[PDB]
């Protein structure tokens, strides 16, 4: 477990960090399509709803590989695995990109080719919880410690990838200037059908209603929960240990209350209070 790597103001994970380097060559495509998020944000629950609209539905292509090989990470370079620059030379357009990048990092490339950018927000509660699990069974982050060490560093934005109130606001921000479809979470979770539908008309595509349901039925958390080739089961236990927590752990908006406590709850209220002030960002912290 190796210790975080500050870069321009950002907490990174020491292999995230030396990444950096190569990724300064990369060359965007005007047809690639970016999806940016905060770290256990449903990263890999839009990656899978996106392959299977540029796959047309069609479950045994989306089966080819695991969705980390069909839709490369920007950033990785895990010990013993392609890099994810490496992995994006050999990806046939038009891409689909994964990334947790800050705009501060993100490849200039990217915003310069006006790349279409996907981006999804979960309310902060669930994303502590979630990131807390995560840090516990990844081996790759620093040792979290407990959960009230975690969370408050997690307020501090002294976590990998850094301060989630400031990479939800810049994107945010960002989305005026920038073709950035916002989603979140939790309206996903309500309405699946409806946030797809959103998406298909974002890329400019169409879809057979029977199929569209189809879909809704495969992004569900109890089906993406089985499938081996989206519940990242398939890296080494050296990566990811889901014997202390699974990849896919609830799947459910509202889990937070069971692990704040009242306490860390009245601190986090007020805290969010004060950095949330003048934004008009909304989350919902239940359904
Ligand atoms: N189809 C799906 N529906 C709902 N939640 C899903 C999902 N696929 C993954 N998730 C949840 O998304 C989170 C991980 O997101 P990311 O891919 O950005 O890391 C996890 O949250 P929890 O651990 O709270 O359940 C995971 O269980
Ligand atoms: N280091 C293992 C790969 C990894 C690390 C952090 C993340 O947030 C993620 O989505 C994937």
Redesign the pocket.
């Known amino acids: 477990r190796p210790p975080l790597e500050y870069v321009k103001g950002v907490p990174l994970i020491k292999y995230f960090a030396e990444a950096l380097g190569p990724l300064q060559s990369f060359q965007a495509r005007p047809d690639d399509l970016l999806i940016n ?13 996106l392959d299977m609209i540029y796959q047309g539905g069609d479950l045994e292509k989306c089966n080819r590989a695991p969705i980390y090989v069909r839709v490369p990470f920007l950033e990785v370079n895990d010990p013993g695995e392609p890099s994810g620059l490496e992995t994006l030379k050999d990806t046939p357009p038009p891409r689909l990109i994964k990334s ?1 990048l800050p705009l501060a990092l993100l490849p200039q490339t990217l915003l310069d080719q006006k790349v279409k950018v996907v981006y ?1 927000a ?1 309310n902060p509660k ?2 502590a ?2 990131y807390y ?2 840090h516990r069974m990844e081996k790759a982050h620093p040792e979290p410690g407990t959960w009230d060490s975690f969370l408050e560093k997690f307020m501090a934005g002294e976590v990998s990838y850094g301060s989630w109130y400031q990479h939800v606001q810049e994107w945010w921000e960002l989305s005026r200037t920038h073709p950035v479809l916002y989603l979140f ?1 939790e309206d ?2 309500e309405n ?1 059908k409806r946030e797809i539908q959103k998406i298909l008309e974002f890329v400019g595509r169409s879809l057979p209603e029977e199929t569209m349901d189809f879909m809704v039925q495969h ?7 089985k499938n081996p080739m ?2 990242y089961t398939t890296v080494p236990q050296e990566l990811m240990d889901h014997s202390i ?8 908006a509202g ?1 937070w209350k069971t692990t704040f406590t009242v306490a860390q709850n009245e601190r986090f209220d007020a805290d969010y209070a004060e950095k949330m002030a003048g934004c008009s960002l909304s989350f919902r912290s239940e359904l």
């Open positions: 998020t905060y770290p256990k944000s449903g990263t890999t629950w839009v990656s899978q709803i947790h999804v979960r669930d994303v919880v979630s699990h995560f979470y996903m979770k699946p992004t569900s958390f109890k089906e993406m929960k989206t519940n927590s699974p990849f896919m752990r609830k799947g459910m889990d």
